[PDB]
Amino acid sequence: AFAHFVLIHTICHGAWIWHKLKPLLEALGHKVTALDLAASGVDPRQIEEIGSFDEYSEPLLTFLEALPPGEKVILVGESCGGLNIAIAADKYCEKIAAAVFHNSVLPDTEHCPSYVVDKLMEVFPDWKDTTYFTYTKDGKEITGLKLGFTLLRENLYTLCGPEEYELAKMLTRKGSLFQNILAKRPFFTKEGYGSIKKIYVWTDQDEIFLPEFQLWQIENYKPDKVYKVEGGDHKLQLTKTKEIAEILQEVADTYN
Template identity: 25%
Template sequence: MADFLFVHGSCHGAWCWRDLIPAVEALGHSARAIDLPSHGADPTPIADVTLDSCRDAVLAASKPQTIIVGHSWGGYPISAAAEAAPNAMRALIYVAAYVPQDGLSMVEMRKLSPRQTIHEAVEKSTDGLSYTVKPDMVWDLFYHDCPPDVLPYAFARLCPQAIAPQDTPLPTSDRFAGVPKAYIRATDDHTIPTEYQAQMSLTAPEAMRHTIDSSHSPFFAQPQKLADLLDKIEKDLAGSQV
């Protein structure tokens, strides 16, 4: 049995793993999710959110045997956690997520993408501290292949995303490089181009690179298939450590 910890992406919260957690638990694993600062039930003011505080939220929930799964922007705080304390986790799994290049922020990473998909979809707050996704673009950007109940469920819970942590460079070293990694690429992603995901997935060994025929939200679109992939990755990790 593995211990999976799920870390959400921009504007989301622990709620987005609603369908995946029971599917993973049915395979015999433990599974839990956290709210990053200012998301979900976390009361942190947006002005106080930093990359470090996001990193610390991950570390506070992780144990040495934990496999940390990060989605989208969640790839950054899980990577920061690995850089800060590589022994505090067993492995990292990126699901349609950003994998940092040494010294670059997520904003800089997004700008390196071969296609820009979200520029017209986001609105910055009047104080310049956060952004939200335009309501009429949420479905196509995140959930276009998801069951119809997902949009009202998610729409009621999406929240502003703090900009500061995403605009903070993340230096990485051999500490980050030494943590085992896997990548699950979404092939029909309208948020992070799948070809860019393929490029970022090269941080993982070839045997630890997988694809799922899904939008940016495979945890809603194909929770069982995603759970099965996580289960396979865990078994492959166990085999590689024998």
């Protein structure tokens, strides 16, 4: 079967991270939407105008609001994109056939929204040449970040070609994890996010979302299916594109 995949990037990135995978899925007959979230990619807003992960997720919510009744999509989020999936599934679960976590955080319904991100900080505490800044928005002090180039090269794009790492240096923008605000956010619900079919795709070769963190997430909240890709790096849609398109085809054939 054919599906409508909605591809969701991670913080500091944009729709451009999907420039290799999107053509491949369309060549198999699928419809593909790759969104820039707020203050990301070529979106005009700056991160200082955004005060929460929910505000950050606005292009995705607006997009899901606009789908005609009875039309369903498969959400595919990479890295922190799993938090944008949780926020959207709580509001539009009728519109989601399934969600695919691609080297992604997997929030639960039992602990606070920042839980899985707090655990990532325990497991991976040194972000090398990443720089931080603070800003205020709606009375809250928010810590923003800009991903360092050595961290980009060594941990996120480990095995990507120099021309793919060059795009990351040219296009990554300031972003935020909004961690202190996720902590105070209401929990994701069991009827919204909790009811969605979840497929967890990962590689043990990931150098930021380390096997210890990823296997801990699978044990904390069991996914409906787990696919482990051999080789690659954190950006599997760049280093294992064809393998990821095979997995998504199989997901299109099971879920609707």
